[PDB]
Design a protein around this ligand. Structure first.
Ligand SMILES: Nc1ncnc2c1ncn2[C@@H]1O[C@H](COP(=O)(O)OP(=O)(O)OP(=O)(O)O)[C@@H](O)[C@H]1O
Ligand SMILES: [Mg+2]
Ligand SMILES: [Mg+2]
Lengths: 375, 126, 73
């Protein structure tokens, strides 16, 4: 009649909606059941084409096999070296694959969250301009250097005292620029296996060669570097081979194009006199302890974001800080807050800053101030 | 389906493998802990985004297929260096080192319980 | 301390230190793990390990003078 089931329709709709959602999950589950019948496939690379239906493929675990090829798969992209997946039971190529990227290499690229700007690395102004002349300029206006006739330098070694701006400068270009930037610890690329240490370097440049405009920032290089002992140890000739591979892929029989390398070290004297030869590490920046002018510039950056009060004099700190490389200057700021935090002060003054300049200088006599320049 | 789904998992023995490259031509290439590589066309009973290159994933022993994402593993040596039985030595037990005990508690313990204080003054803890 | 030389040497241990150096402060501003180090010979330490970014508050522990020996007992 006038009412009928209009009011009762509410209960039916609510019950149906709850039950309707349950059936939705059933469709999702069926998708999983459709994947339980798909088996894996052995992975190997094609070596040669004996005939149209016979191939020589070496699984990248074990032996070499002569196997067939799926009819549909085209037989023109299966060139020697191409990675191909093979069936588990009757070994037969069923798909050509892109060149693999070692998971270490993947982790070597998507690394930096720091986002450091050029305005934070004070004191090093001429050095940055010199470093940008071998990373940015050759990769944006190559026609300039084709005029004179020179080939832009490949490498770059950033050495200096232990505590100046080297890694900070490297991270600066990492946050800037619009090219692939490989970051490597330079000591996490060595493992205990017979050849895995060397393979990680072949892939590093192989990925660099594949992805053009790339920069390979090998960090502290005294690890995988060295002086190539004569009469070394059993597990030291192996690290030597890895150096001889990173060494040969820099300047060897196949010139590497559009891949620039940046290396840093706090002791550029233990390096083999082959890694330092011009052609491999052409330019040798010499990031040094900040000068009187630079020292003042350093303080502002790290002493800027501080709840200061009063005529905080940066001129006083600089004269009393000779040899303060690049961190005790930032230690001076952080230590000063420590003095301020004592006495329950949200209140930093000049005296606290001075009271931290000596406390850091006192804790510096126990270092060994050595230059240790390359040769 | 659940009865059949459990049947593959019911074979509890898995073969731990590390994901090498989560190719999108949503497939995955794994490297079982036997020095064998594979090209699982279908990821399996796991999300295609929860798997990042290098993660530890279990695999069916016979028909290699990802079934679960095991928690990250650490060397047995490194796990044995985490203290569970806390030593009992109050600060009152140490004598003479008063100006130095305080200097440590204010650089390794205090910055761990009063983060609201350093961030108020904008000084990175030592 | 790191050590330059030909005709044999020791860099296996040096890599572990070089990995400690970068892990403590390098290409990553980790700020939740606090490092405490103990040593009774600071002259032998590598200058790189005594920076300001790495272990920072270098405490000196002196012998008891004339009263610490009273409380110490
Ligand atoms: N010009 C500068 N401006 C700002 N901070 C600087 C500067 N120079 C050095 N620093 C400080 O140096 C600290 C560490 O620098 P970095 O690790 O790059 O140096 P390093 O010890 O020579 O490097 P590595 O040992 O990795 O080769 C940074 O936290 C930064 O505060
Ligand atoms: Mg350094
Ligand atoms: Mg070579």
């Amino acid at each position: 009649k006038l009412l009928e089931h209009k009011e009762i329709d509410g209960r039916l709709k609510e019950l149906r909606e709850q039950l309707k959602e349950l059936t939705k999950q059933y469709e999702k589950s069926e998708n999983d059941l459709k994947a339980l019948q798909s088996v894996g496939q052995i992975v190997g690379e094609v070596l040669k084409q004996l005939t149209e239906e016979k191939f020589i493929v070496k699984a990248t675990n074990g032996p070499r096999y002569v196997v067939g090829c799926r009819r549909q798969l085209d037989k023109s992209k299966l060139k020697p070296g191409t990675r191909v997946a093979l069936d588990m039971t009757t070994l037969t190529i069923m798909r050509y694959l892109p060149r693999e990227v070692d998971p270490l290499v993947y982790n070597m690229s998507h690394e930096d969250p720091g986002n450091v700007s050029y305005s934070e690395i004070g004191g090093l102004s001429e050095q940055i301009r010199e470093l940008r002349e071998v990373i940015e300029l050759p990769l944006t206006n190559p026609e300039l250097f084709q005029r004179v006739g020179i080939i832009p330098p490949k490498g770059c070694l950033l050495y200096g005292p232990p505590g100046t701006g080297k890694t900070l400068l490297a991270r600066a270009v990492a946050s800037q620029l619009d090219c692939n930037f490989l970051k490597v610890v330079s000591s996490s690329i060595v493992d205990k296996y017979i050849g895995e240490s060397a393979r990680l370097i072949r892939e590093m440049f192989n990925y660099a060669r594949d992805h053009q405009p790339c920069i390979i920032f090998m960090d502290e290089i005294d690890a995988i570097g060295g002086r190539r002992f004569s009469e070394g140890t059993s597990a030291d000739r192996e690290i030597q081979r890895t150096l001889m591979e990173l060494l040969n892929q820099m300047d060897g029989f196949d010139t590497l194009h559009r891949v620039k390398m940046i290396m840093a070290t706090n002791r550029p004297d233990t390096l083999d006199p082959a890694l330092l030869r011009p052609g491999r590490l052409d330019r040798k920046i010499h990031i040094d302890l900040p000068n009187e002018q630079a020292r003042l510039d350093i303080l502002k950056i790290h002493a800027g974001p501080i709840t200061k009060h009063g005529e905080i004099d940066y001129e006083a700190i600089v004269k009393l800080s000779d040899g303060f490389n690049g961190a005790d200057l930032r230690n001076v700021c952080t230590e000063a807050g420590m003095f301020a935090i004592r006495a329950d002060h949200d209140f930093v003054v000049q005296e606290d800053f001075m009271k931290a300049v000596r406390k850091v200088a006192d804790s510096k006599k126990l270092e060994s101030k050595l230059d240790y320049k390359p040769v | 389906e659940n009865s059949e789904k459990i049947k593959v998992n019911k074979t509890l023995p898995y073969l731990v493998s590390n994901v090498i490259e989560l190719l999108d031509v949503k497939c995955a290439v794994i490297k079982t802990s036997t020095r064998q590589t594979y090209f699982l066309p279908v990821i399996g009973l796991v999300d295609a985004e929860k798997l990042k290159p290098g993660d530890l994933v279990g695999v069916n022993k016979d028909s290699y297929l990802i079934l679960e994402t095991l928690p990250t593993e650490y060397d047995s040596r490194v796990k044995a260096m985490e203290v569970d039985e806390r030593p009992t030595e109050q600060y009152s037990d140490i004598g003479g080192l008063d100006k130095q005990i305080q200097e440590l508690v204010e650089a390794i313990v205090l910055p761990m319980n009063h983060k609201e204080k350093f961030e108020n003054l904008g000084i990175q803890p030592p | 301390k790191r050590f330059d030389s030909e005709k044999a040497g020791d860099r296996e241990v040096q890599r572990t230190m070089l990995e400690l150096l970068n892990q403590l402060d390098g290409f990553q501003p980790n700020t939740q793990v606090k490092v405490i180090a103990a040593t009774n010979r600071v002259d032998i330490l590598d200058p790189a390990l005594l920076r300001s970014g790495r272990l920072d508050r270098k405490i000196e522990f002196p012998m008891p003078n004339e009263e610490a020996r009273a409380r110490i007992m």
